[PDB]
Amino acid sequence: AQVSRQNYFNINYFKDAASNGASKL
Amino acid sequence: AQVSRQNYFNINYFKDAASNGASKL
Amino acid sequence: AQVSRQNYFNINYFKDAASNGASKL
Amino acid sequence: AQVSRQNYFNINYFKDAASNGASKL
Amino acid sequence: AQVSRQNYFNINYFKDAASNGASKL
Amino acid sequence: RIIQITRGDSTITSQDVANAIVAYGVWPHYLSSKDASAIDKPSQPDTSSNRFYTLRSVTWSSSSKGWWWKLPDALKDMGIFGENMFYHYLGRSGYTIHVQCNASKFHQGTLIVALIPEHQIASALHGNVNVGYNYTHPGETGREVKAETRLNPDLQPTEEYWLNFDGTLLGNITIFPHQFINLRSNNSATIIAPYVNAVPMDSMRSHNNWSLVIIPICPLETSSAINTIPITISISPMCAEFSGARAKRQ
Amino acid sequence: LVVPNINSSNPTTSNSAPALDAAETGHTSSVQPEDVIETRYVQTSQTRDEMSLESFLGRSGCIHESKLEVTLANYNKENFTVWAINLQEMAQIRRKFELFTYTRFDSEITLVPCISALSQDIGHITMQYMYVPPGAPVPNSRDDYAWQSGTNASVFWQHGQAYPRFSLPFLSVASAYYMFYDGYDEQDQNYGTANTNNMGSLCSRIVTEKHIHKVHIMTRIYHKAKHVKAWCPRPPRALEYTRAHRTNFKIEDRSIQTAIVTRPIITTA
Amino acid sequence: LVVPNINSSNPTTSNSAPALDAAETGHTSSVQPEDVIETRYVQTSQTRDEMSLESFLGRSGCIHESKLEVTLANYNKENFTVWAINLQEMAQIRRKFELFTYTRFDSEITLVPCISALSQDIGHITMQYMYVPPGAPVPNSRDDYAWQSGTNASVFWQHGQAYPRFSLPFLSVASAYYMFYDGYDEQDQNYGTANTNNMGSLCSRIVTEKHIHKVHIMTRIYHKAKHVKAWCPRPPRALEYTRAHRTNFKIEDRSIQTAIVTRPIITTA
Amino acid sequence: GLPVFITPGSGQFLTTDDFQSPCALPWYHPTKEISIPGEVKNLVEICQVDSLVPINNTDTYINSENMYSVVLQSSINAPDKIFSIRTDVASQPLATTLIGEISSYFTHWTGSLRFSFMFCGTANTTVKLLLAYTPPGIAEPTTRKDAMLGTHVIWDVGLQSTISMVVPWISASHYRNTSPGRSTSGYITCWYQTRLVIPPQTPPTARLLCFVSGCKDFCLRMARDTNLHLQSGAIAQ
Amino acid sequence: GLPVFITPGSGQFLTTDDFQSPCALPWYHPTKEISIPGEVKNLVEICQVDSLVPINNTDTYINSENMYSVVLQSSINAPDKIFSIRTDVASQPLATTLIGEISSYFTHWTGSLRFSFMFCGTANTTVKLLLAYTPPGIAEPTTRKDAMLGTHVIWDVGLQSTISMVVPWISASHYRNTSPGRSTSGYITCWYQTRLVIPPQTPPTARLLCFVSGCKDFCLRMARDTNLHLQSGAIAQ
Amino acid sequence: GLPVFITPGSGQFLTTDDFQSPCALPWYHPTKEISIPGEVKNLVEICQVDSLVPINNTDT
């Protein structure tokens, strides 16, 4: 789904979840 | 949705909204 | 939609329409 | 649609069909 | 479909299946 | 193979002619509200100037080499058309043109007539030179082509007719709307054109938005003592319009 | 866009016959090939699409040659160039456009910067370009404030960077570029395109500060017209070019040796 | 965003007439072009979008010039620079903003690093930048602990790398940047923008350790304002700049040669 | 990774580019836009502002208000010329107007211009005057009747302060270039349609001030770093 | 960022590439396309135009109109050859025609060619003539009867001005190369089918002009920077 | 532009690779495949052909 604070869709693609290193509040 | 002046779809993907730096009229 | 002469979908993404520089017949 | 021998979707995007140079059997 | 351990969609695109070299458990 | 012609007040015929191709098939018309640049309601002299006018007699021989004109300048003296042109900064007009060239059944030779666009004439001399206004704008007096001694040669155009005076091959000239006076085929020839420019209307005296060429592709002859025939051309402007009225131009 | 098929044509003769015409009409002659050949039906099925304008105009070619030497003695003054934008000084591209009254297109522009060493190394080098539309202040000096460019299209290249490119839209104050013009700027000099075709200039300048390497920079600049439209075809150039804007062709101490070649007799092929 | 079409205007006269006004009102004068020309209807249909603020402000330009020499004798001390952030010392960009009371925008920032060789080679070189907001500890030395940057926006470039860029959001403690100010910091010095416009500074420093190549590094730094807004237009600068924050223009041993040019008589164009 | 391949025009910086970019300062938030008065969206609203021509651009007036003004001579029984100017938006003196500068920041212009004129003389005084425009390709007029053949207005100097009038857009091309080199757009020209008449022992003099702005018709293209202003050397601080 | 990996063919410039590109001049807008006459979409409409062959390509005619023309001799009781030419579109002289140049800008051609011919002599005069084509692999004919075995037309010179006729496409391959090296497409050849007869004291002479164009059948491939024209050195300005 | 990052195996040429590529010759069109006899899809049909052994591989 789209970004809650915002007006666009973007989501993870790199393999293992810990490796993302970018969190919501 | 598609571009109002135009014939194609394109939308933001970079993280924080101010950082886009490209506005409609 | 897909390419009329062809078997795949591809469409513009660069910002201002004149800048595309590639036309159908 | 998805790849018949396989488990994923991938399709052409480069402009003129002859230029692809990769065929099914 | 989405990743079973996870919260996002990602899937193969390179041509021949053996060449992927990355497996589920 | 017969026609009659009627514009503004005046009429023309040949009873040995094949009809004009209309240039690009576009029958002449006024500007559009969709395309215009100029703001006023422009000057429509209509019948009083979208009527025929004709040039002084040229005449030709086996020895003759060619003739041409640049428009509207070739018509600067055509009363209403001429002054309405000179009193405005801008205007536009197409043209109907017929060239008058009868011979006997006992003559041979042929001319090509080409309507031609900006037809940007090359200099006579080599090097850092360009054509002077007096010669690009010969008026109704036109430019016949001659063998000798045209003064101010550095500012003269070239005489090289088979290089179309611009370094392009003749015979490909049929790329433009064109006809042949062929003395067997016809006794006259005709062409009609709308207005044209990259701009919706233009600075008449400053730019010859159209041009007309006639060339002796095949030499005139007869055994008769009448060794030469005149040619004359008549033109009506079409949908003629003018805008930005002020004093008479010098 | 394709030719039709050609039908079978029956062998016949009749009082009706179209093979005769009056070329003097100006119209093209008796049109049809099936008229004088008893053809078989053939799937004549060869596309004209390479023959399209978005093909023929729509292949790039070189336009101009921005050669420069890096001067040392006043590095800060000399090391820039400016060129008046025209399609009139490389023959092939010129002849594409010297084929019409007018044309309109958007432009792929592509830069092929090259550094040539007159010294044992070049080091890192960076280079500026600017489109100078007319009435922009032209840079006078490699240190000119005019290298600042708040709104002028200015762009950068450096050693090891890929070829720069940009899309330039159709520019003219009019509907289409004049390929030719038949008069003057209103006080009667510069006859022809030198009136109408004031696009201003491209510019280039070394951006790296003073450094020890004597070098030449050469940019070959390329363009392709796309999204093209063209207006009333006109005959091709028959002979060598001479004078950019001007159609001049009678060269000095020379003669008019056109593309036509002679033969000994017209009865021999 | 477009002009309207213009209608046809009938040739008329009447007791009603708008061609007369009182400019002294402050309001702009008799507005309408169809009033005094008997026009034809025209599709006046030319877009104002290039004239938009997100266009006119929204083209990048250079801002400042970070020139440095790599000192050898104390490489560890000297080889860094700091610059007070302002839009007030490159004229074109300055004049975009010297057009209003206030403006607000997000900023594309773009770095054009250049290495100039004073030696036979440059080798690999890497370079640091830091935004130093006020009350960050300013680096004193090319070896200062202040090159560590746990939260300061610090960014890196090296030979052969592409041009760095970042998006910087609108910064001010207020709604918009003061283009001008009419007073002081509260104890009455630094009159005008030198009060309000304390953005702190940009900084740069060579990151590669001591090495044999004498070199100059020059960074041209560029910015474009986008997502722009602006506040009450004000008249353009008439004369050369002089003093960054200050509107000073009366230059020393000089006279006020403005952009206006004189003519011999007012009856001659 | 996805099979990708790289087009030319990569790896350059273009000062007039258009793209997303990453943040230097993530998680930051800007100050709110309070409702400051004096909103703006485009340059055309500035074009709509009447600004004075420094009409009277000569040595004897330049370093003063007086180059915005002209002086009229009630002593003269004549039809003759009061002043004239070009009409090309980035020509002198017009370039120095704010529409002038905005046009000077641009390469193409289009649409008709508004012009305006106040009879700044003594309230007791009367005249009617000719303000006229010359469609070009021709010299600037040398009789009043020449200007009367041009498009023009005769000013009924009634109680109302100002006459306002338009040079019609009569460019061949939909645009014109903003600065002419060897080129022209036409002339403004001004003439005594009547003599100026003061009543007795009024000052033997009058003043006129002249204004211009973009009409609703007006527009520009090819924003360019303006002719109008020069920086020499470094801007000190 | 997305995991990506880079194929060869990256980082080159190809003068014949195809792609989107970023704008140098964002927010700009072009002038509108007014309805200029003389539209065009393709080169084939130029091919459809009849253009003259400079048939008579020799020293005695080259610097003149006369190389487009041939002269006929009413004095001769003979069947014999009037002229002949190749048929390869980029061969001399045909290359110099506009279809010739367009073909010279190309590497492959296909489809039949239109040819046309006017009896430019005295209106009172009569003849019938043989225009013929030679399917190749064979020498250019040396008797009229040889050409009569080829595909050909006999011209009834009626009131109507022109005979027009076609070389049929008889290439083995669907295309042929536009310029032959050591190769051939066949011949045009022309002959007195009757003698030419003027009536008494007419000029002892006649003229013929010859035209060609692409038929509806015609097409090209492999656009190439043409043989036909040369630039030496710099083009001065 | 989209945030992207580059895996190893980039920037090589492999003579046995597999990819799309851009055209040198856009707008061109090939000649049609007439029904030539002697079709083939694979090497195995060649394998199916009986061929002689040079069984008697000696000098004589």
Side-chain angles (χ1 to χ4, degrees), chain A residues 1-5 7-25, chain B residues 1-5 7-25, chain C residues 1-5 7-25, chain D residues 1-5 7-25, chain E residues 1-5 7-25, chain F residues 2-250, chain G residues 1-118 120-269, chain H residues 1-118 120-269, chain I, chain J, chain K:
Chain A
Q2 294 211 130
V3 175
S4 182
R5 73 161 303 297
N7 64 349
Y8 75 99
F9 199 129
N10 196 6
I11 284 298
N12 184 80
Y13 45 74
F14 182 73
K15 203 74 174 78
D16 290 1
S19 193
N20 165 49
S23 316
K24 290 187 293 181
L25 302 181
Chain B
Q2 294 211 130
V3 175
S4 182
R5 73 161 303 297
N7 64 349
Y8 75 99
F9 199 129
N10 196 6
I11 284 298
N12 184 80
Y13 45 74
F14 182 73
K15 203 74 174 78
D16 290 1
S19 193
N20 165 49
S23 316
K24 290 187 293 181
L25 302 181
Chain C
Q2 294 211 130
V3 175
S4 182
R5 73 161 303 297
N7 64 349
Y8 75 99
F9 199 129
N10 196 6
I11 284 298
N12 184 80
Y13 45 74
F14 182 73
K15 203 74 174 78
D16 290 1
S19 193
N20 165 49
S23 316
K24 290 187 293 181
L25 302 181
Chain D
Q2 294 211 130
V3 175
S4 182
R5 73 161 303 297
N7 64 349
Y8 75 99
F9 199 129
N10 196 6
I11 284 298
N12 184 80
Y13 45 74
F14 182 73
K15 203 74 174 78
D16 290 1
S19 193
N20 165 49
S23 316
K24 290 187 293 181
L25 302 181
Chain E
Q2 294 211 130
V3 175
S4 182
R5 73 161 303 297
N7 64 349
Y8 75 99
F9 199 129
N10 196 6
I11 284 298
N12 184 80
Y13 45 74
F14 182 73
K15 203 74 174 78
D16 290 1
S19 193
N20 165 49
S23 316
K24 290 187 293 181
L25 302 181
Chain F
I2 306 187
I3 204 83
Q4 86 179 39
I5 309 297
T6 291
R7 297 290 187 164
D9 73 340
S10 38
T11 73
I12 339 288
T13 176
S14 162
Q15 44 165 324
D16 182 30
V17 67
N19 64 276
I21 176 60
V22 178
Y24 326 96
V26 182
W27 204 23
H29 62 78
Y30 297 99
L31 84 180
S32 178
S33 57
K34 190 158 59 182
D35 291 6
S37 176
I39 264 51
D40 72 8
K41 187 170 182 173
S43 188
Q44 292 188 344
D46 192 4
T47 49
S48 64
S49 191
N50 297 282
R51 44 150 284 157
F52 287 90
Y53 301 90
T54 188
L55 316 180
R56 78 287 160 262
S57 53
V58 299
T59 187
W60 87 292
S61 63
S62 56
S63 63
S64 297
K65 292 298 198 291
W67 315 253
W68 60 257
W69 305 265
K70 282 177 175 274
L71 333 180
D73 178 65
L75 309 98
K76 78 186 189 174
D77 199 23
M78 298 319 134
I80 304 301
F81 191 64
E83 45 251 9
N84 198 338
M85 180 283 293
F86 283 130
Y87 276 76
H88 292 83
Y89 170 52
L90 302 182
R92 52 179 274 164
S93 191
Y95 305 97
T96 55
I97 299 104
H98 166 194
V99 310
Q100 292 84 33
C101 315
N102 58 282
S104 84
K105 200 72 69 73
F106 233 103
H107 291 68
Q108 66 192 13
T110 286
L111 305 309
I112 302 191
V113 70
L115 177 73
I116 192 165
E118 301 68 31
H119 190 31
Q120 180 177 327
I121 310 296
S123 58
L125 196 63
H126 46 262
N128 190 7
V129 295
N130 205 349
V131 195
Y133 187 89
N134 303 315
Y135 319 114
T136 52
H137 292 66
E140 169 263 11
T141 317
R143 193 175 194 102
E144 182 263 16
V145 179
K146 67 194 296 272
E148 289 298 345
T149 59
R150 311 187 85 137
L151 64 75
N152 196 29
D154 38 333
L155 287 299
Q156 292 295 335
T158 182
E159 300 293 282
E160 212 71 70
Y161 62 94
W162 60 283
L163 302 189
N164 307 326
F165 324 97
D166 75 343
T168 65
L169 295 185
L170 182 60
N172 295 338
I173 198 164
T174 52
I175 190 55
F176 309 111
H178 65 277
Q179 279 213 328
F180 316 142
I181 290 292
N182 170 297
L183 309 183
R184 184 172 194 274
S185 301
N186 53 50
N187 74 14
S188 259
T190 171
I191 197 74
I192 87 171
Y195 180 68
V196 60
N197 205 324
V199 293
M201 85 157 69
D202 186 25
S203 187
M204 313 298 262
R205 188 248 43 136
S206 312
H207 175 253
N208 280 296
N209 211 160
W210 263 128
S211 177
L212 195 293
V213 169
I214 182 87
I215 288 300
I217 181 60
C218 320
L220 183 62
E221 64 181 354
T222 182
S223 312
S224 196
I226 181 156
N227 64 4
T228 47
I229 73 180
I231 291 180
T232 280
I233 304 97
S234 193
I235 302 97
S236 177
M238 296 289 118
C239 296
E241 284 277 25
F242 312 83
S243 187
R246 77 312 191 234
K248 198 266 168 189
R249 166 72 220 216
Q250 277 55 250
Chain G
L1 187 151
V2 298
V3 292
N5 290 350
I6 191 173
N7 211 334
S8 298
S9 180
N10 291 18
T12 63
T13 54
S14 49
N15 171 54
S16 52
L20 289 295
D21 73 66
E24 319 77 63
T25 53
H27 199 285
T28 267
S29 270
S30 307
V31 294
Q32 200 156 296
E34 287 181 35
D35 189 51
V36 304
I37 299 102
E38 46 277 271
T39 56
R40 182 62 170 148
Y41 188 121
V42 181
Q43 295 197 22
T44 46
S45 59
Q46 291 70 45
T47 188
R48 291 166 160 194
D49 299 334
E50 186 170 10
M51 317 175 73
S52 64
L53 267 43
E54 192 77 343
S55 173
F56 179 73
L57 294 315
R59 285 180 181 174
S60 205
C62 205
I63 314 297
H64 177 53
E65 292 210 317
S66 184
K67 153 61 154 56
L68 165 147
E69 174 166 319
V70 175
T71 322
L72 308 184
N74 195 338
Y75 187 97
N76 298 352
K77 180 70 64 167
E78 180 166 339
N79 301 339
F80 74 99
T81 76
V82 181
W83 165 74
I85 293 155
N86 70 98
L87 301 188
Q88 289 172 307
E89 68 188 303
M90 285 190 174
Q92 295 161 21
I93 285 288
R94 185 175 177 158
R95 289 171 91 277
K96 295 203 192 180
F97 289 100
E98 183 138 30
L99 187 55
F100 298 102
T101 58
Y102 332 117
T103 63
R104 175 198 178 90
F105 46 87
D106 302 314
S107 285
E108 158 277 292
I109 305 304
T110 301
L111 287 71
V112 182
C114 301
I115 304 169
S116 289
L118 294 90
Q120 300 95 329
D121 204 320
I122 61 150
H124 180 205
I125 296 292
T126 302
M127 169 52 67
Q128 174 166 13
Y129 304 85
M130 173 161 51
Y131 172 43
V132 185
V138 186
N140 303 272
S141 166
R142 178 270 159 202
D143 285 14
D144 198 319
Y145 88 103
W147 301 122
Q148 305 165 178
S149 304
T151 64
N152 298 345
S154 302
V155 67
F156 299 94
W157 181 86
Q158 67 198 332
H159 175 250
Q161 182 193 320
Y163 308 106
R165 155 178 296 176
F166 52 87
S167 308
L168 174 128
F170 176 72
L171 298 182
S172 188
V173 295
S175 319
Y177 302 127
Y178 288 90
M179 315 289 69
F180 302 91
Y181 176 81
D182 201 6
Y184 303 86
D185 301 306
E186 61 283 347
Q187 62 299 83
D188 313 331
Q189 298 169 290
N190 309 39
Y191 169 82
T193 61
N195 310 126
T196 38
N197 298 50
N198 187 357
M199 292 298 101
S201 299
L202 187 61
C203 178
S204 67
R205 165 252 193 183
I206 189 164
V207 181
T208 27
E209 303 309 312
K210 180 180 177 184
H211 71 88
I212 63 166
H213 300 306
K214 49 177 69 169
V215 298
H216 289 182
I217 298 179
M218 166 46 167
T219 317
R220 288 193 169 75
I221 173 60
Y222 289 76
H223 145 267
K224 180 175 59 185
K226 269 204 175 188
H227 202 59
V228 312
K229 294 298 298 283
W231 301 103
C232 180
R234 97 173 208 83
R237 179 71 174 205
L239 185 60
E240 284 255 25
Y241 290 115
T242 308
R243 212 78 209 194
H245 285 286
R246 315 182 192 151
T247 52
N248 302 351
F249 67 80
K250 208 303 298 181
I251 290 158
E252 189 155 16
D253 302 344
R254 281 297 302 108
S255 178
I256 52 187
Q257 283 66 82
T258 76
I260 308 161
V261 179
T262 52
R263 60 175 160 152
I265 192 66
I266 302 308
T267 50
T268 291
Chain H
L1 187 151
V2 298
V3 292
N5 290 350
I6 191 173
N7 211 334
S8 298
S9 180
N10 291 18
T12 63
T13 54
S14 49
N15 171 54
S16 52
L20 289 295
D21 73 66
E24 319 77 63
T25 53
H27 199 285
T28 267
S29 270
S30 307
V31 294
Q32 200 156 296
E34 287 181 35
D35 189 50
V36 304
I37 299 102
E38 46 277 271
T39 56
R40 182 62 170 148
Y41 188 121
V42 181
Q43 295 197 22
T44 46
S45 59
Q46 291 70 45
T47 188
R48 291 166 160 194
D49 299 334
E50 186 170 10
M51 317 175 73
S52 64
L53 267 43
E54 192 77 343
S55 173
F56 179 73
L57 294 315
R59 285 180 181 174
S60 205
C62 205
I63 314 297
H64 177 54
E65 292 210 317
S66 184
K67 153 61 154 56
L68 165 147
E69 174 166 319
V70 175
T71 322
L72 308 184
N74 195 338
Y75 187 97
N76 298 352
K77 180 70 64 167
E78 180 166 339
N79 301 339
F80 74 99
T81 76
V82 181
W83 165 74
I85 293 155
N86 70 98
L87 301 188
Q88 289 172 307
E89 68 188 303
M90 285 190 174
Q92 295 161 21
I93 286 288
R94 185 175 177 158
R95 289 171 91 277
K96 295 203 192 180
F97 289 100
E98 183 138 30
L99 187 55
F100 298 102
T101 58
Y102 332 117
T103 63
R104 175 198 178 90
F105 46 87
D106 302 314
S107 285
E108 158 277 292
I109 305 304
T110 301
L111 288 71
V112 182
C114 301
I115 304 169
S116 289
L118 294 90
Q120 300 95 329
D121 204 320
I122 61 150
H124 180 205
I125 296 292
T126 302
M127 169 52 67
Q128 174 166 13
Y129 304 85
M130 173 161 51
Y131 172 43
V132 185
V138 186
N140 303 272
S141 166
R142 178 270 159 202
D143 285 14
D144 198 319
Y145 88 103
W147 301 122
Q148 305 165 178
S149 304
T151 64
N152 297 345
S154 302
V155 67
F156 299 94
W157 181 86
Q158 67 198 332
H159 175 250
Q161 182 193 320
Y163 308 106
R165 155 178 296 176
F166 52 87
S167 308
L168 174 128
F170 176 72
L171 298 182
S172 188
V173 295
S175 319
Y177 302 127
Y178 288 90
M179 315 289 69
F180 302 91
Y181 176 81
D182 201 6
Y184 303 86
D185 301 306
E186 61 283 347
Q187 62 299 83
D188 313 331
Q189 298 169 290
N190 309 39
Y191 169 82
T193 61
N195 310 126
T196 38
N197 298 50
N198 187 357
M199 292 298 101
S201 299
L202 187 61
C203 178
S204 67
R205 165 252 193 183
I206 189 164
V207 181
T208 27
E209 303 309 312
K210 180 180 177 184
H211 71 88
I212 63 166
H213 300 306
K214 49 177 69 169
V215 298
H216 289 182
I217 298 179
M218 166 46 167
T219 317
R220 288 193 169 75
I221 173 60
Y222 289 76
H223 145 267
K224 180 175 59 185
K226 269 204 175 188
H227 202 59
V228 312
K229 294 298 298 283
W231 301 103
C232 180
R234 97 173 208 83
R237 179 71 174 205
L239 185 60
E240 284 255 25
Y241 290 115
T242 308
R243 212 78 209 194
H245 285 286
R246 315 182 192 151
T247 52
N248 302 351
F249 67 80
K250 208 303 298 181
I251 290 158
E252 189 155 16
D253 302 344
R254 281 297 302 108
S255 178
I256 52 187
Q257 283 66 82
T258 76
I260 308 161
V261 179
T262 52
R263 60 175 160 152
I265 192 66
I266 302 308
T267 50
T268 291
Chain I
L2 272 294
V4 297
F5 107 109
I6 298 155
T7 312
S10 293
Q12 51 72 25
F13 160 52
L14 164 78
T15 205
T16 52
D17 68 5
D18 205 25
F19 297 112
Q20 283 161 67
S21 152
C23 190
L25 295 174
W27 303 115
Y28 174 77
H29 183 82
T31 303
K32 276 177 168 58
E33 302 88 342
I34 73 189
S35 295
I36 307 185
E39 261 287 16
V40 48
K41 187 176 184 176
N42 194 293
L43 304 179
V44 294
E45 45 267 47
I46 298 100
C47 308
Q48 201 71 248
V49 171
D50 298 316
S51 57
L52 293 174
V53 277
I55 169 64
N56 176 37
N57 59 315
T58 94
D59 164 75
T60 51
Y61 312 106
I62 175 59
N63 305 312
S64 83
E65 70 285 1
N66 298 280
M67 46 57 167
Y68 301 108
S69 73
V70 302
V71 187
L72 308 309
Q73 296 71 33
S74 186
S75 57
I76 310 184
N77 287 334
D80 72 2
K81 188 185 292 173
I82 301 173
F83 62 76
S84 61
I85 317 92
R86 306 200 80 184
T87 54
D88 315 59
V89 287
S91 64
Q92 293 280 345
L94 278 161
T96 67
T97 68
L98 40 64
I99 316 98
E101 169 61 314
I102 292 292
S103 81
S104 304
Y105 264 111
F106 273 75
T107 314
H108 308 149
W109 66 294
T110 187
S112 311
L113 270 287
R114 186 182 305 108
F115 299 74
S116 296
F117 304 91
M118 297 67 56
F119 171 58
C120 318
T122 302
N124 72 5
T125 295
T126 77
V127 66
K128 54 177 178 179
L129 292 182
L130 174 65
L131 280 299
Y133 164 64
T134 302
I138 196 161
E140 202 266 294
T142 300
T143 92
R144 191 180 70 194
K145 193 65 63 175
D146 313 348
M148 186 173 176
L149 298 170
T151 292
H152 67 273
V153 167
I154 303 93
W155 183 1
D156 184 0
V157 190
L159 173 61
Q160 191 53 280
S161 308
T162 320
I163 188 64
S164 300
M165 68 95 79
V166 161
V167 172
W169 183 261
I170 310 290
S171 178
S173 44
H174 290 82
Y175 303 82
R176 187 178 283 124
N177 52 296
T178 48
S179 182
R182 205 274 190 185
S183 186
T184 305
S185 303
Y187 305 105
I188 304 307
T189 197
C190 177
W191 307 71
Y192 289 113
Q193 204 276 358
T194 60
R195 168 173 174 203
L196 168 66
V197 54
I198 70 188
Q201 76 254 290
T202 302
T205 42
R207 287 281 178 145
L208 158 67
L209 271 277
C210 306
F211 266 113
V212 289
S213 53
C215 186
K216 188 171 71 177
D217 192 18
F218 180 76
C219 193
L220 300 177
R221 335 179 291 200
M222 276 302 103
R224 55 155 207 225
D225 299 306
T226 179
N227 166 68
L228 188 141
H229 173 84
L230 181 145
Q231 167 193 328
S232 59
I235 295 172
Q237 59 173 337
Chain J
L2 272 294
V4 297
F5 107 109
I6 298 155
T7 312
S10 293
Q12 51 72 25
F13 160 52
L14 164 78
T15 205
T16 52
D17 68 5
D18 205 25
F19 297 112
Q20 283 161 67
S21 152
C23 190
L25 295 174
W27 303 115
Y28 174 77
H29 183 82
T31 303
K32 276 177 168 58
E33 302 88 342
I34 73 189
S35 295
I36 307 185
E39 261 287 16
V40 48
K41 187 176 184 176
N42 194 293
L43 304 179
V44 294
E45 45 267 47
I46 298 100
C47 308
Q48 201 71 248
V49 171
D50 298 316
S51 57
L52 293 174
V53 277
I55 169 64
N56 176 37
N57 59 315
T58 94
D59 164 75
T60 51
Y61 312 106
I62 175 59
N63 305 312
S64 83
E65 70 285 1
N66 298 280
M67 46 56 167
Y68 301 108
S69 73
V70 302
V71 187
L72 308 309
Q73 296 71 33
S74 186
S75 57
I76 310 184
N77 287 334
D80 72 2
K81 188 185 292 173
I82 301 173
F83 62 76
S84 61
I85 317 92
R86 306 200 80 184
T87 53
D88 315 59
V89 287
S91 64
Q92 293 280 345
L94 278 161
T96 67
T97 68
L98 40 64
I99 316 98
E101 169 61 314
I102 292 292
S103 81
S104 304
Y105 264 111
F106 273 75
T107 314
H108 308 149
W109 66 294
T110 187
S112 311
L113 270 287
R114 186 182 305 108
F115 299 74
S116 296
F117 304 91
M118 297 67 56
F119 171 58
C120 318
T122 302
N124 72 5
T125 295
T126 77
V127 66
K128 54 177 178 179
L129 292 182
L130 174 65
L131 280 299
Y133 164 64
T134 302
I138 196 161
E140 202 266 294
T142 300
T143 92
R144 191 180 70 194
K145 193 65 63 175
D146 313 348
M148 186 173 176
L149 298 170
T151 292
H152 67 273
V153 167
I154 303 93
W155 183 1
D156 184 0
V157 190
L159 173 61
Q160 191 53 280
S161 308
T162 320
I163 188 64
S164 300
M165 68 95 79
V166 161
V167 172
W169 183 261
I170 310 290
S171 178
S173 44
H174 290 82
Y175 303 82
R176 187 178 283 124
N177 52 296
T178 48
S179 182
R182 205 274 190 185
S183 186
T184 305
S185 303
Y187 305 105
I188 304 307
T189 197
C190 177
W191 307 71
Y192 289 113
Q193 204 276 358
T194 60
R195 168 173 174 203
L196 168 66
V197 54
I198 70 188
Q201 76 254 290
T202 302
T205 42
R207 287 281 178 145
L208 158 67
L209 271 277
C210 306
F211 266 113
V212 289
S213 53
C215 186
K216 188 171 71 177
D217 192 18
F218 180 75
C219 193
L220 300 177
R221 335 179 291 200
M222 276 302 103
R224 55 155 207 225
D225 299 306
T226 179
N227 166 68
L228 188 141
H229 173 84
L230 181 145
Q231 167 193 328
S232 59
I235 295 172
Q237 59 173 337
Chain K
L2 272 294
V4 297
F5 107 109
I6 298 155
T7 312
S10 293
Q12 51 72 25
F13 160 52
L14 164 78
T15 205
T16 52
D17 68 5
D18 205 25
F19 297 112
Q20 283 161 67
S21 152
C23 190
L25 295 174
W27 303 115
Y28 174 77
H29 183 82
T31 303
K32 276 177 168 58
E33 302 88 342
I34 73 189
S35 295
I36 307 185
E39 261 287 16
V40 48
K41 187 176 184 176
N42 194 293
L43 304 179
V44 294
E45 45 267 47
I46 298 100
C47 308
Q48 201 71 248
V49 171
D50 298 316
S51 57
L52 293 174
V53 277
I55 169 64
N56 176 37
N57 59 315
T58 94
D59 164 75
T60 51

